[PDB]
Every structure is written in structure tokens, then in C-alpha cells.
């Protein structure tokens, strides 16, 4: 599988994770990946410029939140739930409890 | 005994992404961690950057995002965690963040 860049768990920090979630578009991506499982980039039809969405997914990958792979021409994103729960127990649940939907609303 | 606070948003204007962005920095997370365990703290206690303009910007972000109040008292600026606002809006968030925050 063509996995895109992603850090090893050891190089994932709490400030980086909080930073990655610190954006309405990125929070909404994480919220949908958590509830619906893996989703290609094109499912996140935000009213947002192409280069900006690309930077968003780079931020999510560099921070250790999302694992992306190329399948065909799709970029398939996966929430790194197991890594995040191992490092930061209960963090995802506390964030997702309060995250307000955007794309489904 | 001053209740003279710098600009802070109303509870209704605090958003979860804005709060997470404010915590999403080693200096700012440590400020929040210290306010949470030690109580109110003067700005001069937080020597977490080479430049004073960098610390000023950290506190500006903490105040504008709804995490921190800043009180002007004499010559000092005293910071206070907005525990009630944050816990009412984002139940369990502060605990989850603080449980994993590592001392800087
Ligand atoms: Cl795609
Ligand atoms: Cl306001
Ligand atoms: Cl001060």
C-alpha cells in the first residue's frame, strides 16, 4: 500500500495533535473519520480552496492524527485512533463529544 | 483587588477549534497546565520564549480564544484559567488535555 508520510508514534506530541484539531475544517475531518471510518479526500466537500485543503491534510498527517494512502487515484484517510488512544487516553472522546458538525448540518 | 480585565470573549463566542488552536503550542499548553495546578499567575512567571513579542502573542491567543482572562493589577498582568466557561462548553476537555500534558 502507498502510505503517505506519517510520523512514528514516538514523534507524536500533544501540542501537535491539539494544533491539528485547532481548525474547523480539520476538526470536521477528524469528526467524520471517527464516526464513518475511512474516507477519501474528495468526500470532504468544504467551500475551501484546493491548496488550503491540501495544507490541512498535510497538517493532519504531520501531527500524527491521520494516516493517508493512495488507492487508485483516491487519497484514503484513516484516523489514527489506536495511536492517539495509546498516547492521549480519552482525548479524542472529549473532543468529539463537543465537536459541532459542519458538513452533515 | 482589581476586576479590570483585558479583552476576553463572551462564553457564547468561544469555539472548540479556537480553544484547541490556543492549546496547540508547547509554550501555551504549559501556561494552561500551570494555571490549572497553581492558580492565578503573573505573566512574568512564563519565560517560555526568547522574545517578549512572542510571549505577548501567546497570551493574546490564550485570551482571544477564550482560555485565559488577564487582569491588570498595578504593574503586573495576572492570568486566570477560564475553568467554568471551558468546563461548561467542553465537558471533560480540560481534564483530558491536562492528564496527558507533559511539563515543558
Ligand atoms: Cl480523493
Ligand atoms: Cl464576545
Ligand atoms: Cl507580569
Numbering used by the authors:
A (entry chain B): 1 to 105
B (entry chain A): -1 to 102
Pull text from the paper.
In the heterocystous cyanobacterium Nostoc sp. PCC 7120, one such strategy is the use of an ArsR-SmtB transcriptional regulator RexT that senses H2O2 and upregulates expression of thioredoxin to maintain cellular redox homeostasis. Different from many other members of the ArsR-SmtB family which bind metal ions, RexT has been proposed to use disulfide bond formation as a trigger to bind and release DNA. Here, we present high-resolution crystal structures of RexT in the reduced and H2O2-treated states. These structures reveal that RexT showcases the ArsR-SmtB winged-helix-turn-helix fold and forms a vicinal disulfide bond to orchestrate a response to H2O2. Each protomer of RexT has an α1-α2-α3-α4-β1-β2-α5a/b architecture.
Second, this SeMet structure was used as a model for the molecular replacement to determine a higher resolution structure of native RexT to 1.95-Å resolution. The asymmetric unit of the RexT crystal structure contains a homodimer of RexT, which is consistent with the oligomeric state observed in solution using size-exclusion chromatography. The dimer interface of RexT is formed by a coiled-coil interaction between the α1 helices (residues 13–22) and between the α5b helices (residues 91–96) of each protomer. The buried interface area is 707.6 Å2, ~11.5-percent of the total surface area of each protomer. The location of the Cys105 residue, which is only modeled in chain B of the determined structure is located ~20 Å away from both Cys40 and Cys41. Similarly, in both monomeric units of the reduced RexT structure, the mainchain amide of the corresponding Cys41 interacts with a molecule, which is best modeled as a chloride anion from the crystallization buffer. In the dimeric structure of RexT, the wHTH region shows an overall positive electrostatic potential and appears well-poised to interact with DNA.
